[PDB]
Structure formats: structure tokens, C-alpha cells
Amino acid sequence: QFQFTGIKKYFNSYTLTGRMNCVLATYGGIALLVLYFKLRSK
Amino acid sequence: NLFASFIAPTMMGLPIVTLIIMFPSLLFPTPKRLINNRTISIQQWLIQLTSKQMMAIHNQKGQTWSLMLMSLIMFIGSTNILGLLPHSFTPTTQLSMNLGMAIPLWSATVFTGFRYKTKTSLAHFLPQGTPALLIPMLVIIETISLFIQPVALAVRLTANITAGHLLIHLIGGATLALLNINTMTAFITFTILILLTILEFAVALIQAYVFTLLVSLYLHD
Amino acid sequence: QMSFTFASPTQVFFNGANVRQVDVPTQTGAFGILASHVPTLQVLRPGLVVVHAEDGTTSKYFVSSGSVTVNADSSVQLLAEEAVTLDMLDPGVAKANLEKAQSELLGAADEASRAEIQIRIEANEALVKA
Amino acid sequence: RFRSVISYKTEEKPIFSLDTVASAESMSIYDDIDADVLRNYQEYSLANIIYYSLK
Amino acid sequence: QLDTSTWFITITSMIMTLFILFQLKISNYSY
Amino acid sequence: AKFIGAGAATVGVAGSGAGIGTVFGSLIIGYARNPSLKQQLFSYAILGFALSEAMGLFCLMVAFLILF
Amino acid sequence: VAYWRQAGLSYIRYSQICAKAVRDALKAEFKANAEKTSGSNVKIVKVK
């Protein structure tokens, strides 16, 4: 709403590199899948 | 028994980990006047004092990261100090958020270095100067040394706080048990003495966590 | 293998003499000089300096302040403001001066003047030992 | 400067009592130095040169 | 105990708070 | 037997940390006296660090061999 | 740095004090060296 314009410069200027959270998401998903498989094996 | 607080993501009918982790922000009022009350003047003086001691190394590009680092240090420091309360629940105990903190910033630095200074960023693996004729041996040393930074950076934080709380709980249990058999105030003396060190041990961890990232960023900037 | 010159603003004791070793009570601990010692530059403190001659005899002198210099070769220049021998000293007057300087400490008011008094008591206590 | 009972010569000598200029490459051979020591050493060298000139 | 494979909520909430709340409040400062 | 042998042989890498701490400490004090000669000091330091880490790696390899 | 330093005292002042202290301890027979020292013969005239 009225908060995007406050830090819009930051988001589109310098956090471009820091915006790579894909590695963390993939690692978390893989860990969760492995844990689910282990739990299902029982 | 002992492992009750740690494995307890804010037990309730609906999880309230978000409420617990968002609570510390309701202690930093935002300034709205030229001259303000006492409670915010100290905060801004402290922020000014801390800023000039750490971000005074980077030339121009590292000055952009100033807001992120100050926010990070204030957040971790506020989270750790609030956990000393008798029945609190420190979110920094959990490994999940520690793992979700280290990886993004480390990745940002490492592939920011390659984007602009690829020639020099590739050279940092080989130590500067002539290292005799042992080049292939140390080349594989520093590259594996690269990958261990986030793991240690998370694990030390995940470990030390739990160790401290375990010590406090065990000493409390010990001083409770010895009430029935004989009289010994040495144990409560140990507790009150250790509490000072546990109180002042958090801020050192905050400082080390921020400083290591500062050094890592400055290398590739 | 040494050229030692122990001079004073008034008289000269040695001029290019060759001795085996010289022991100096400088600042920041004692010292020992033999053969090709590493170069150094240090000031002195009130104490006793002994010089070992090639024959084997040891000559003794008392030094108040000055400078020490050992150069690249085996050349040593020891220039001191004072250079005296014990035979012209009185131990009793030394003890009396020390006794007065003791109460001078409590007599002092300001830390600079008491620093001067402390230098006084340091010199008096140093000399009464021998 | 006194040269003979019937002649004399006028001369001057330089002073490098500044600490910063003293700390140069050639001083690296001396290996037990400190800033305080060099300050005291220059202090003494000044009085020595003055006394020699008067005499 | 610390590894129970329920790590989604904490990461989401931490990202939200750190990257919105604290930066916005800390930006309104003078020096 | 394999598990306990592996768990006992892994201890030998402890000395590598002490040696690394020693060499790096010497470089710090050494640089303080003669900053001009910082070029030659490193070569020595690297040599020592590499040698100690090689000894530690050798012990680790022996432990891995006894495990398998 | 010693106690005399950081106390308003210079090395020359300390040398003067120690030399005076040593000269005091001399025997009365040899006390003619005060004539030789006689360090006070120069007056000071400032610009204003």
C-alpha cells in the first residue's frame, strides 16, 4: 500500500543479489522430503 | 524433562511462533519530533555509536549495506536478551532460522564478488605471493575452507545458548535437591555468579556474528 | 674485538680500549655485551656498570644517566652525565637522605611534585644497595 | 671552530631530531627500539650538540 | 528435539519480520 | 572393533590446531618489527602450515583406512 | 612509559634530578665538584 514506496529503492537497487533464496528453499524442501520418506518407512 | 522448552514451538491450539518472534519489535518507537523523550534518545545514540565503529572500512559500495547490518545486529541482540526471562522461549535456539539466516547473505556476497571482479575474485583462492611449489596442495585446502563458513556460523549460535540454558537448569535442580539434605548456599552462589556471564555472553555472540559477515563482504567488495 | 669509550663531560676513562665484555644496568632490564652483539640504542638508569678487562680484572663505576650505542661493528660508545667511584662516597649520608626522602612522599601534595619525590627516593634507594 | 692560535673556521651541523625522519629504512638494523626510546635519544642528542658548540 | 521437520513457519516469519519491520522502523533516524 | 578403532584413531588430528595457532602467532609478532620484510616471512609461514595440515591429513587417512 | 613520564617530567629533568642526587651523596672532601658543575650561570630573557 503506502509502505512499498518507502523502501522501493532498496529492493530494486541493491538486494538483487540477496534475493536468491532459492538455495535455502531447495535445501529445506529436500530435507523435508527425506524426513517424510524416513517417517513413512517406519 | 530437560529438553522441554527447546522442542516446544509455542505449544497452543494454533501455533504462535509468529507472535513470539514478532514481539521484540514493539520496543523501538519511531522518532516523530526534533526533541524526544529519554527512552528513544538513548536508542538513537547507541545506534549512532555502533554504526561508526563497524561500517568505517568499506569504500562506497559497502556503505549501502549499512541498514541491513544494523537491523540484523539489533534483531539478534534483542532476541537473545529477552530469553533470560524465567519462562521465555528463545527463537535463536531453533536451528531452522539460523540456517535460514546464514545462507542468503553468504550466497549474496559470494556471487556478488564474481559478478564485478571475476578476475580478482578467482585469484583469492591462491594465496598472494609465491607459496613455494606446493600450489596444487593448498588450492584444494582453501576451496573446501570456503564452504564451511555458513555451517559453523549457524552451529555455534545453535549450540552455545542451549549449553548455557542446560547449565542453568541443572544447577537449579541441584540447589533444589540439596535443601532436604544438609544446608549449602554455595549452589545458589554459583547460580548468581554464572548469571552475570550468561547475561553478558549474548552480546559478544551478536558482535562476532555481525563482524564475520562484515569481513566476508569487504573481501569481495 | 671491541672499541670501548666510556667518556664524561669532564674526563675520559677509556678511548678505543679493547675489553671482552661490559655489563650495563640500562632501562628495561639489564644487559650483556660480547663479541658481535645485535645493534641497540637504549638510555641508562642509576646503577653500577662493570667492565671485564682482557686480563680478567673487573673495573666498576657508578652511572646516573646517559646513552648507550652499539654499532654495526664492535664499537660501543657509553656517554654518561655522571661517572663516580664508591671510594669518595659516604653510606651514612646516603641513609640519612633516604630517611628524609621517605617522609617526603607523604609530605607531597601534587602528583607531579610527588613524581619528582619518587625519582628522588628511587635514586636514593638505588645507590644505598652498594 | 678553533683551528689554530691565529686562525679559525666557521661551520654548521645539521639536526635530525624529528622522530618521523629518524624512522627510516637504514634504522631497521637496530632491533630493540620503540617510539619512547627514540624520543628520549633525540632529547639527549640535542643537549650534547649544544655543549660541544659552546666549548 | 530441535529437528522435527516443521521448519516452514519459523523461516517465513523470520524473513517477514527481519526484512520488513526492523528496516522500516530503523530508517526513520537522524544523525 | 572397526567402530572403536575409528573412534580412537580420529584423535590424532588434535595437534594440527596447536601448530597452526603457533605459526600464525609468530607471523603477527614478526611482522611488527620489520614490515619491510613481509614478503619473505609468509613463505616460511605457509610452509609450516602446510606441513602440519599434511600430518593431520595423514592421521585422518589412517583413521579412514581402519574404518574401511 | 614510566611513572616519571605522563607526569609533566622530561628525560632531561629526570637526568638533572638523578645527577643532583648522586652528587649529594659524595664525601664532603670531594664536594668541590659542585664548583665544576655550576649549572646556573645563564639567564633567560623572553621576547616580551
Swiss-Prot record, chain B:
The keyword Cytoplasm does not apply. It catalyses: H(+)(in) = H(+)(out). Keywords: ATP synthesis, CF(0), Hydrogen ion transport, Ion transport, Membrane, Mitochondrion, Mitochondrion inner membrane, Transmembrane, Transmembrane helix, Transport. Its main location: mitochondrion. GO terms for cellular component: mitochondrial inner membrane; proton-transporting ATP synthase complex. It comes from the Eukaryota. The keyword Chaperone does not apply. Coiled coil: none annotated. The chain crosses the membrane at residues 3-23, 65-85, 94-114, 133-153, 161-181, 186-206. GO terms for molecular function: proton channel activity. GO terms for biological process: proton motive force-driven ATP synthesis; proton transmembrane transport. It is a multi-pass membrane protein. It is found in: Mitochondrion inner membrane. Subunit a, of the mitochondrial membrane ATP synthase complex (F(1)F(0) ATP synthase or Complex V) that produces ATP from ADP in the presence of a proton gradient across the membrane which is generated by electron transport complexes of the respiratory chain. ATP synthase complex consist of a soluble F(1) head domain - the catalytic core - and a membrane F(1) domain - the membrane proton channel. These two domains are linked by a central stalk rotating inside the F(1) region and a stationary peripheral stalk. Component of the ATP synthase complex composed at least of ATP5F1A/subunit alpha, ATP5F1B/subunit beta, ATP5MC1/subunit c (homooctomer), MT-ATP6/subunit a, MT-ATP8/subunit 8, ATP5ME/subunit e, ATP5MF/subunit f, ATP5MG/subunit g, ATP5MK/subunit k, ATP5MJ/subunit j, ATP5F1C/subunit gamma, ATP5F1D/subunit delta, ATP5F1E/subunit epsilon, ATP5PF/subunit F6, ATP5PB/subunit b, ATP5PD/subunit d, ATP5PO/subunit OSCP. Belongs to the ATPase A chain family. This is ATP synthase F(0) complex subunit a. It comes from Sus scrofa. The lineage of its organism: Eukaryota, Metazoa, Chordata, Craniata, Vertebrata.
UniProtKB/Swiss-Prot annotation, chain E:
It is found in: Mitochondrion membrane. The chain crosses the membrane at residues 6-22. Component of the ATP synthase complex composed at least of ATP5F1A/subunit alpha, ATP5F1B/subunit beta, ATP5MC1/subunit c (homooctomer), MT-ATP6/subunit a, MT-ATP8/subunit 8, ATP5ME/subunit e, ATP5MF/subunit f, ATP5MG/subunit g, ATP5MK/subunit k, ATP5MJ/subunit j, ATP5F1C/subunit gamma, ATP5F1D/subunit delta, ATP5F1E/subunit epsilon, ATP5PF/subunit F6, ATP5PB/subunit b, ATP5PD/subunit d, ATP5PO/subunit OSCP. This is ATP synthase F(0) complex subunit 8. Belongs to the ATPase protein 8 family. Subunit 8, of the mitochondrial membrane ATP synthase complex (F(1)F(0) ATP synthase or Complex V) that produces ATP from ADP in the presence of a proton gradient across the membrane which is generated by electron transport complexes of the respiratory chain. ATP synthase complex consist of a soluble F(1) head domain - the catalytic core - and a membrane F(1) domain - the membrane proton channel. These two domains are linked by a central stalk rotating inside the F(1) region and a stationary peripheral stalk. The lineage of its organism: Eukaryota, Metazoa, Chordata, Craniata, Vertebrata. The chain holds residues 3 to 33 of 67 of the full protein. The gene is MT-ATP8. It comes from the Eukaryota.
